[PDB]
Design a protein around this nucleic acid. Structure first.
Lengths: 105, 105, 239, 114
RNA sequence: UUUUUUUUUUUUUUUUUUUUUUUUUUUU
RNA sequence: CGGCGGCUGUUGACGGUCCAAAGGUAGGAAAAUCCUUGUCGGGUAAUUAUCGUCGUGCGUGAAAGUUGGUCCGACUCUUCACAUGUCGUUUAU
RNA sequence: GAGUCUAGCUUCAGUUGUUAUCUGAUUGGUAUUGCAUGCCCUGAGUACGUAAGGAAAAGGAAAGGUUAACCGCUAUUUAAACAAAAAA
């Protein structure tokens, strides 16, 4: 906390997010104290970090799946269904109300 | 959030006391459900839940514990709760951004 | 207009990577998808220059993902074709073809002419290394090495220019510091070829350049001549 | 951040539950931690002794707060503490307290690092 | 990867920053 | 079938006098009417806006339709609740 | 005749306000401040004053607010998902 005052600090929490970068990488920790939830993000590369330890891990393929950059299955994403809407002032084309359309029909 | 006071709400207090005593969540929210009825109060509840106990379990088992806990107080079919594991908190992206009233009780 | 506004407005404006098309995105993608299949089925298409420069982006990706021969890649290829005929051709005539071609299977040719009815530019989108191509294509693989060796052996200037490059390819004999004499020694089997498995009949087929010929005559026009239809029908005016 | 017409809770054990902000030294609704503000009491307990218009300072903020060291601190609620004669009215503070508080009232908190 | 304030930085210079114009050519 | 009032004396049941066919009844009452801040109470950090009430400040007025229990509401207004770029203050496709 | 970099002029407000005599071989002879809201600290509990009470010269810093610039960090939105092997 304070180098001059020799005041240290010890935080504990569960990992929620790990932003993977080169130098600006950080980790987000969340916990609760007396029913009040607190959240703090700490950079990986920092000179202030006295120590870092893990109390309980969750080694499993689910964590590895989250810890990996996945690729699209198909090129269907280019469809952009969210853009398929109808104008308020536009001519009537079927029985679709103003707004996003449907794909069932 | 809540300008003025609100009518007596014992069920909300009971739910808050029971959840914080049994499930020990880290991100627990609650509010009254107005979609069920505007002229009705202290009947229907809606909120978000998250606790470490839901790690390494399927959705069926995750919701079974919530239903069992609600059965002990008699509010099983009156609370619409959305729960996700702490690791998958990103799934609740579009569930925190929403306004959360502040009931007095 | 004034022809000055174009210039005045364009100042400090970034270029668009993907050219805009008439219609919603869902429509645009459909359009491009169908045109890719039509391009695969023809071998050359005549299109406007802007559009010819746009379709070539997916024309390359289709063949790039078709050569992987993986379940994953197969999915992506499936996700870019409509008709079975285009799938068949892509998987039976184009994949074997570009066995040795790292990339760049298509090109765009400008016609330097304007449409009569529209006054718009025109261009051709033709595949590379196909029958009746506009211009010949360069060799790849062992063909390239043979070409290079030929060039080297031709004249001194070629030798000098290719000296450095030849070393990598192995066309220079390190034991004597001279160009390799026998070039056939660098022959290797390609993927396109058929691996070894290991008559007095009157109905024997006759060898011929694209496909063999039967020993019998069948009264039938070519595939492109046995199905006629009016291109356009006049619409009488109603005064 | 915080803005006028905003409801915030009280971290002290005086008895007040929540209060409405009346004023703040800001224009763009970016209220920070440790900023003096005026509160109007809306609800009270049957054994409360707080005034009608207590004066306090922002302790906790929902919105994330940036640190000098490149870190960030976030909370789940917005609470304040009453101040009188340059001292707190109550005797204990509920929950943790951030480091970004120039005032010495943070010593009454239980976990300054949390 | 792009844009933006909801983020960050400055609040100094004025003979400074900058600029479309070499002028002994008094009848192009 | 138009409508229905003066002086003066003790807050004033009561006494004098002029006039007339009769000389506002009861109810409502700060009002589809006087006045664009009447006294007090409920809401808000502020209420002259609005409800309740008093019945003086001016005044309306009974099959001219007055008052109104219950029920009822595309009729004014007070006030509560959810979401919300209405907003300080504006962004991206 | 031609290419580059430039002199002069021009530029928000505005002005004409600067150097007698001259250390004898003795550590040497003006120097980038025009300008200015509020609160706090050192000076200072000092000057002042029975008492209550309570200044300036200078510097240092935390909010709020305006202009301009930018994408290293955070927040919102959003796009992309393709060629290392000359055995390919």
């Amino acid at each position: 906390l304070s180098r001059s005052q020799q005041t240290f600090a010890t935080f504990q929490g569960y990992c929620v997010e790990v932003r993977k970068k080169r130098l600006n990488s950080s980790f987000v920790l969340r916990n609760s104290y007396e029913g009040i939830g607190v959240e703090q993000r700490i950079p990986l590369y920092s000179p202030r970090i006295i120590s870092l330890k893990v109390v309980s891990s969750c080694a499993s393929p689910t964590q590895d799946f989250l810890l990996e950059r996945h690729k699209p299955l198909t090129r269907d994403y280019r469809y952009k269904w969210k853009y398929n809407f109808r104008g308020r002032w536009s001519r009537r084309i079927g029985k679709h109300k103003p707004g996003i359309r449907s794909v069932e029909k | 959030a809540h300008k003025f006071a609100a009518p007596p709400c014992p069920n909300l207090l009971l739910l808050r006391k029971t959840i914080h005593q049994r499930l020990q969540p880290i991100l627990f929210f609650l509010k009254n459900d107005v979609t069920m009825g505007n002229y009705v109060y202290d009947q229907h509840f809606k909120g978000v839940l998250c606790s470490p106990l839901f790690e390494g379990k399927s959705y069926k088992e995750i919701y079974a514990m919530v239903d069992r806990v609600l059965e002990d107080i008699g509010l099983s079919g009156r609370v619409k709760l959305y729960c996700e594991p702490p690791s998958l908190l990103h799934k609740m992206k579009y569930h925190v951004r929403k306004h959360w009233p502040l009931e007095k009780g | 207009g004034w022809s000055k506004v174009v210039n005045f407005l364009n100042k400090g404006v970034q270029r668009r990577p993907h050219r805009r098309l008439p219609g919603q995105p869902h429509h645009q993608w459909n359009m491009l998808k169908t045109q890719l299949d039509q391009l695969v089925r023809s071998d050359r298409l005549e299109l406007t220059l802007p559009r010819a420069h746009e379709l070539q982006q997916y024309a390359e990706e289709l063949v790039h993902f078709a050569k992987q021969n993986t379940p994953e890649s197969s999915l992506i290829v499936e996700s870019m074709i409509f008709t079975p005929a285009a799938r068949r051709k892509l998987f039976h005539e184009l994949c074997p073809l570009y066995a040795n071609r790292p990339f760049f299977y298509t090109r765009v040719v400008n016609q330097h002419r304007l449409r009569m009815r529209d006054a718009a530019p025109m261009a051709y989108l033709e595949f590379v290394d196909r029958p009746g191509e506009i211009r010949p294509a360069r060799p790849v693989g062992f063909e390239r090495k043979q070409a290079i060796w030929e060039e080297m052996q031709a004249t001194r200037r070629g030798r000098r220019q290719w000296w450095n490059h030849a070393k990598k390819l192995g066309l220079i004999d390190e034991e004597t510091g001279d160009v390799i004499s026998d070039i056939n020694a660098l022959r290797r089997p390609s993927a396109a070829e058929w691996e070894e498995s290991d008559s007095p009949s009157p109905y024997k087929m006759v060898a011929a350049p694209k496909r063999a010929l039967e020993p019998f005559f069948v009264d039938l026009p070519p595939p492109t001549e046995r199905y006629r239809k009016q291109r356009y029908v006049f619409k009488r005016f109603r005064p | 951040g915080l803005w006028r017409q905003s409801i915030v809770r009280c971290a002290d054990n005086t008895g007040v539950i929540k209060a409405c902000i009346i004023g703040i030294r800001n224009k763009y609704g970016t209220g920070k931690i440790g900023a003096r503000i005026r509160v109007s009491v809306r609800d009270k307990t049957p054994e409360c002794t707080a005034p009608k218009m207590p004066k306090g300072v922002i302790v906790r903020r929902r919105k994330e707060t940036r640190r000098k060291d490149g870190s960030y601190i976030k909370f789940d609620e917005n609470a304040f503490v009453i101040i009188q004669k340059n001292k707190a009215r109550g005797t204990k503070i509920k929950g943790p307290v951030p480091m970004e508080i120039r005032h010495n009232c943070k010593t009454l908190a239980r976990w300054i690092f949390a």
